[PDB]
Amino acid sequence: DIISVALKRHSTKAFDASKKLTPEQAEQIKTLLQYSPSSTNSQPWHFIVASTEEGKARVAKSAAGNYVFNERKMLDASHVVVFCAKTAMDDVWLKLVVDQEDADGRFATPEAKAANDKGRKFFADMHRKDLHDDAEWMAKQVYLNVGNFLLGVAALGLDAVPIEGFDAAILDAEFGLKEKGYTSLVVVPVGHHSVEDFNATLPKSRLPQNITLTEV
Amino acid sequence: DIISVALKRHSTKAFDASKKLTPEQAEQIKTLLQYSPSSTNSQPWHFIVASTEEGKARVAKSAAGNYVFNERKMLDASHVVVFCAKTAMDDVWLKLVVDQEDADGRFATPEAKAANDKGRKFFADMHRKDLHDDAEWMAKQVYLNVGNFLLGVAALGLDAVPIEGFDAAILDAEFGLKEKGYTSLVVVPVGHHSVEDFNATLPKSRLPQNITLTEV
Ligand SMILES: Cc1cc2nc3c(=O)[nH]c(=O)nc-3n(C[C@H](O)[C@H](O)[C@H](O)COP(=O)(O)O)c2cc1C
Ligand SMILES: Cc1cc2nc3c(=O)[nH]c(=O)nc-3n(C[C@H](O)[C@H](O)[C@H](O)COP(=O)(O)O)c2cc1C
Ligand SMILES: O=CC(=O)CNC(=O)c1cc(N(CCBr)CCBr)c([N+](=O)[O-])cc1[N+](=O)[O-]
């Protein structure tokens, strides 16, 4: 049951370094990252999955300043994924998406391929020329990916925690992003929790539906 | 189990108006909206859940102009959820968030309630006083809610489609969201697809992992 998973999941404050992810779960984590939906299937993202202790130590360098309380989570967890968004939407990426949709057989006639590319460009240009927020629109898609991911890993029987508490500039310089056209937004350490986790015993807190919801 | 859901779920292009959500599923989707995570448990959102023919007509008014291709989805779906974000993060709302965490039993000492409030304000101030990307940071959390919701409703045996193709100005004014302190971002119709949904039989297409993923 998925509601049980939504009510029982939590943001893990401490992981067990010994409890590693099985090769099956390690593959499944990558499937969730790839198959997440996005506006017009633009998929303006990049993922860095750190499984080695040397790779996790490289990611943990972003939380070395005033974000020290987030360092231990990034090293003790089995798999650590950093979510990156595109800095700008190029015509080459819009071409890469539609050619991949064509290779997969989503279009019957080549005219339908052009109709899809036109509609995608209509949305992409509205954000590039008119609204001037392509960087925010693409980052919004990556945040949708994080939402899909957290629920997916909680349902896989794995513990995770989303981290916004890191210096993005240090993480960009450690992996050579920006020059490659990407920016780090969220870091999600995945694995299993330990007994030092002061959040697994604590109840879940959310505002009531009378304040945040209206039915019409 | 959810890997199966993530690989099988799709964006429905046509719904069946007679196929309604069971009374329990209608309560389950609302739980999914609320129990979603957000940075510092800030929950900078509001949800309008349209289930009546009159309520869905009010939402469908935003599917005008070059967004006419989304009118059917908003009217034929059983339930239509409008994801809204706060326009500005006020201090009275940050107080509402900590007081709810105090009534749920997350803090043992009053020193723990003052420590979380400080930790919330550190992040809140970094976005409203320093970076000035307050509306964008809150909008990101709302998109995180959508990702959680899409995979969530898909695991419930329901069909859905996230919509960005609508007029935010029309929707906002129709529900008077601006004066209440909110803005509409994503509209998600929930129900069951009809035989006219070409996307139900079409294969899922995503970019390969050799382009979007790097293992370290
Ligand atoms: C985008 C995002 C950023 C977050 N950043 C942090 C962080 O830097 N450190 C941390 O310990 N928790 C962080 N969290 C966890 C939240 O505090 C947590 O999701 C929220 O309190 C709700 O609790 P829950 O996850 O147990 O439901 C973040 C959550 C989200 C979704
Ligand atoms: C934020 C967002 C906005 C979208 N807007 C629309 C829309 O206005 N109309 C539509 O038919 N599909 C829309 N989609 C559906 C995408 O095209 C779809 O997610 C993508 O093609 C991948 O296909 P899938 O969802 O079946 O995996 C949107 C998706 C997201 C996540
Ligand atoms: O949900 C309320 C609480 O249970 C915990 N809140 C957080 O998840 C949370 C907690 C912290 N701190 C508190 C400053 Br001493 C670090 C200790 Br874990 C911070 N932070 O300041 O980085 C951010 C979030 N954050 O979410 O960004």
Curated annotation (Swiss-Prot), chains A, B:
Gene3D superfamilies: NADH Oxidase. One of its GO terms (cellular component) is cytosol. Keywords: Flavoprotein, FMN, NAD, NADP, Oxidoreductase. InterPro entries: NfsB-like, Nitroreductase, Nitroreductase-like, Nitroreductase/BluB. It is an enzyme of class 1 (oxidoreductase). NAD(+) binds at K13, T40, N70, K73, R106. FMN binds at R9, H10, S11, T12, K13, N70, E164, G165, K204, S205, R206. Coiled coil: none annotated. GO terms for molecular function: 6,7-dihydropteridine reductase activity; FMN binding; identical protein binding; NAD(P)H dehydrogenase (quinone) activity; oxidoreductase activity; protein homodimerization activity. Disulfide bonds: none annotated. Its EC number is 1.-.-.-, 1.5.1.34. NCBIfam families: PRK11053.1 (NF008275). Belongs to the nitroreductase family. Reduction of a variety of nitroaromatic compounds using NADH (and to lesser extent NADPH) as source of reducing equivalents; two electrons are transferred. Capable of reducing nitrofurazone, quinones and the anti-tumor agent CB1954 (5-(aziridin-1-yl)-2,4-dinitrobenzamide). The reduction of CB1954 results in the generation of cytotoxic species. Homodimer. This is Oxygen-insensitive NAD(P)H nitroreductase. The gene is nfsB.
